[PDB]
């Protein structure tokens, strides 16, 4: 089961979205946080 997380959002919608129910970022292409980030650059804001 996998679902109810800014990882989980197909787009970056939802990831910029609604930050206080998930925790992951957009990174350089997937939705994902610093633990995800193997550079540490970590993204959440891109969509307009």
Same mark, same amino acid.
């Given at each position: 089961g996998s679902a109810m997380g800014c990882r989980h959002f197909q787009s $970056?919608?939802? $990831?910029?979205?609604?930050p206080p129910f998930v925790q992951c970022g957009w $990174?350089?292409?997937?939705?994902?946080?610093? @633990? @995800? $980030?193997?550079?540490?650059?970590?993204?959440?804001?891109?969509c307009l």
């Open positions: $970056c919608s939802q $990831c910029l979205s609604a $990174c350089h292409d997937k939705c994902v946080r610093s @633990e @995800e $980030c193997l550079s540490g650059t970590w993204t959440q804001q891109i």
